[PDB]
Amino acid sequence: GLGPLQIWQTDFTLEPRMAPRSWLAVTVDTASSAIVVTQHGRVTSVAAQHHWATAIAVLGRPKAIKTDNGSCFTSKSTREWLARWGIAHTTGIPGNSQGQAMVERANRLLKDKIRVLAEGDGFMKRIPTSKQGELLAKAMYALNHF
Amino acid sequence: GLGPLQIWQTDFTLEPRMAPRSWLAVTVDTASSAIVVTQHGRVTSVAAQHHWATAIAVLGRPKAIKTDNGSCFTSKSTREWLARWGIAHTTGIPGNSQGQAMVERANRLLKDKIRVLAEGDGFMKRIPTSKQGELLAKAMYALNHF
Ligand SMILES: [Ca+2]
Ligand SMILES: [Ca+2]
């Protein structure tokens, strides 16, 4: 009962191998280190809400989420969506510096796993679109379980 | 170490509120009762592999999966995909009768939660396409956590 708080860190990261939906939305559960990733065609507020809808189904509802001040995260729409769910939102400190370091380490382990699985399949450039889906699933698998 | 075996039961179920991608692929982890659902436009073998790719990222790799003899599940393609992952597959007994009862109970709790959340939003018929995604996320959330 003295366990970790259910706080998430989310961010978006660009990955051209995953084009056209090359914007990967990544969420790290700081309680368990689990990771949830979704792809999007454009960074929008709505992209951020859809990514969270999916992470919540997978991780359960957090008590809070930390993001940077990107505008897709502090727009009105996003504040209202998070309010409707009852989740608190913080963008940390104005000149944070650090503080979002797990989601950033996550971003880097993820892109690396994607490159190594993609190349294992013989794709050295963009991944065929029909194949990105299982590859992105496979990457997430590899970083969360086995 | 005497805990339950990681065996899944998967099935596809039709849901017109979710049209055009009205075929919902549902997987129950018989170890934890967690549920994973994905939508598809057509019931194909490939639909079954994509659904599992996503469930594995979410639940980890099972030791076995039980399905009925639908052809999308015993086709060559599907047998080879499951073989590549190292998961055993069984379709149970020829005139099983029961044995897939959790995935079927799941199918029914799911469609019911979708109807009640959809109607809470004022959609009494098909759900606008742009809205199905979070609604399907929301349903899964409700049946797995809170
Ligand atoms: Ca950012
Ligand atoms: Ca069936």
Q: Please state the domain extents for chain B.
A: 1-146
Answer yes or no: CATH 3.30.420.10 is held by domain B1-146. Answer: yes
The two tokens of residue A141 are 């698998």
Cα A123 from Cα A104, distance rounded (Å): 25
- Please give the method by which this entry was determined: X-ray
Residues 122-141 of B with CB under 8 A from A: 133-134, 137-138, 140-141
* Residues contacting B136, CB < 8 A, separation 6+: B18, B24, B37, B39, B114
Q: Name the residue facing A145 among B49, B61, B146 (closest C-beta).
A: B61
Cα B39 from Cα A52, distance rounded (Å): 18
Q: What is the resolution of this structure in A?
A: 2.2
Inspect the interface and report whether the beta carbons of A133 and B58 lie closer than 8 Å.
no
* Partners of A28 in beta bridges: A9, A35
Cβ-contact B6, B63 below 8 angstroms: yes
Which of chain A's residues have a Cβ under 8 Å away from the Cβ of B32?
A: none
B80 is in an annotated binding site: no
Inspect the interface and report whether the beta carbons of A58 and B60 lie closer than 8 Å.
no
How many other C-beta atoms lie within 10 A of the C-beta of residue B98? 8
Cα A144 from Cα B66, distance rounded (Å): 24
Q: Determine contact: A58 vs chain B, CB below 8 A.
A: yes
Residue A38 belongs to what H/E stretch? Answer: strand A35-40
Inspect the interface and report whether the beta carbons of A138 and B60 lie closer than 8 Å.
no
Q: Determine contact: B116 vs chain A, CB below 8 A.
A: no
